[PDB]
Amino acid sequence: GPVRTPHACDFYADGTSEAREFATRTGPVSGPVLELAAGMGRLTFPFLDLGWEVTALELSTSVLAAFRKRLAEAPADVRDRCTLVQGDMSAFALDKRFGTVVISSGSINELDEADRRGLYASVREHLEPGGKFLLSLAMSEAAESEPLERKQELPGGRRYVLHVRHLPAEEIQEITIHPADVCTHRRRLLAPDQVVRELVRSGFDVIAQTPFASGGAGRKDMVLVEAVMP
Amino acid sequence: GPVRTPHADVLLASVGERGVLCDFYDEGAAADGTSEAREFATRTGVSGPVLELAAGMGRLTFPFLDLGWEVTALELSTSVLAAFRKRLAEAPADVRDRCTLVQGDMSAFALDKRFGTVVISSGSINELDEADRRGLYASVREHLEPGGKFLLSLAMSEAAESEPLERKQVLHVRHLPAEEIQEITIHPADETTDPFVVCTHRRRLLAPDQVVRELVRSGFDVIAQTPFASGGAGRKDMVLVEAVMPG
Ligand SMILES: Nc1ncnc2c1ncn2[C@@H]1O[C@H](C[C@@H](N)CC[C@H](N)C(=O)O)[C@@H](O)[C@H]1O
């Protein structure tokens, strides 16, 4: 069913800039790239334009058909560089390994906690040694802000100072679309720091976290996370 | 080892050698909830047996027992149950006999008994990840009698207390708090002391409204949510949630 918000029928771009941010933090890419939950190629087409060879993994049959149709419209050199694969980013086996594994924010926020461990484990099995796992992650106002530290003085007779902070971990992005004269959606919104803690917990060293602007200009509303297997 | 907080980092540099970094839940030279217990009592008003989940060493249980309540207290840790059993042995035989102690996992438990009231505290539900909480909710449903209540206390952070900020554009967007990490750093008000022990800890801190969404999704009707102060006065730092099975 639909979500009845406080101000309420449910609600259900260009990846050139986001794609380039990925290309900056990989450097030179010897070998094919695995993109997880590729959708209809919002990022995959920009990746192919960088000359990459991409294996694009997507769960939906319907979304795959849209992707395949788009590929048929592309020049032969583009299409020839894209291998489409039906699969589940939280649990896949292609038997092959890759120098680079890529996932966008819209995709990782699709997975709950247990499914994310599925994802992390699967990526470990598909990275060649010295391989790079790259993630973009949306960063909310709360996730970017320094947490407000609270102080309290407390006795017993021995006096103590208690400091408390609250670190962002997960929010819900709630939407209400409106004819200005009733559409609705709640989605998960992980703090990049949360995903990074999860990455470390699951085996990775996180070597860089670079904020960037998704649309290539203005406020930096995303983070590129580079993770590697030690 | 322990969580090395930003404030801990700078203290330990500034203290040189007197300084030791510890987690709050270990070597601890550093419990009363008669007021939280009263919030529960105030929102029950009782027919029969009460199930208390993750009862710990009875910080709420003993207060409940003092009200005439028959309490089943469920706890996972055997050492904690041992310490509960000791306290319960030093208690008047009227208190001692209205208390049943059971070892169990509040995420997947099963008793040969149903209850008019089931209670859990914030400290406790935040013990559980998302999957385990679903296990909790399902298990609780199975232990409620017709018309029985599930009562939860939930700590409420500043971000959880605020009305989420909107950005009108018409497009209404809100970011609702779901889960935070509560991070503490505790040290003596002095600086000498010796040893200078800095105590840190990180725990899960769910938004009361997130738990409410989760309860509703699990098949409960949430029929009230009441903010209250855990120290009977000051900022209301806690919410009392009441849930029932729709009949
Ligand atoms: N478990 C899963 N495995 C693989 N793909 C998934 C899974 N769950 C959801 N998806 C897909 O993840 C995608 C998420 C979308 N936001 C599209 C992302 C796409 N990279 C884009 O930029 O538009 C959808 O295309 C879903 O069909």
Ligand SMILES: Nc1ncnc2c1ncn2[C@@H]1O[C@H](C[C@@H](N)CC[C@H](N)C(=O)O)[C@@H](O)[C@H]1O
């Ligand atoms: N899965 C579980 N089932 C039952 N008890 C648990 C579980 N996980 C943790 N605990 C206990 O939950 C308690 C949490 C504590 N904050 C104590 C709660 C107690 N009501 C008090 O106010 O002191 C500890 O006693 C843990 O041993």
